[PDB]
Ligand binder design. Structure first.
Ligand SMILES: *[C@@H]1O[C@H](CO)[C@@H](O[C@@H]2O[C@H](CO)[C@@H](O)[C@H](O)[C@H]2NC(C)=O)[C@H](O)[C@H]1NC(C)=O
Lengths: 28, 50
């Protein structure tokens, strides 16, 4: 049932998510 | 295979929208028929084909 897997108020966290051309990119 | 659609597909996409299309005021009730055509149909591959 799987095809792919991956494993790698004082706080402000900013993220950007983009998905183009079959590529899913994140910036942090 | 899909015969007709109302939107183009971007490269490398899998879409779950495999429902019916309507071309008339009458209610199709989700059943295929005249003026209620279905986009997905087979080609019936056979050895004699070109
Ligand atoms: C990605 O999937 C969405 C969700 O199915 C598609 O959005 C639909 O597109 C059809 C085509 O015109 C519309 O009739 C629907 O109303 C849209 N929304 C839904 C919830 O089905 C979208 O078209 C797909 N991406 C591409 C490039 O086709």
């Amino acid at each position: 049932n799987c095809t792919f897997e991956y494993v790698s108020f004082k706080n402000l966290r900013e993220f950007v998510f983009k998905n183009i051309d079959g590529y899913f990119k994140i910036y942090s | 295979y899909r015969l007709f659609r109302k939107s183009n597909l971007k490269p490398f996409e899998r879409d779950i929208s495999t429902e019916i299309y309507q071309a008339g005021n009458k209610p199709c009730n989700g059943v295929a028929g005249f003026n209620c055509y279905f986009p997905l149909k087979s080609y019936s591959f056979r050895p004699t084909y070109g």
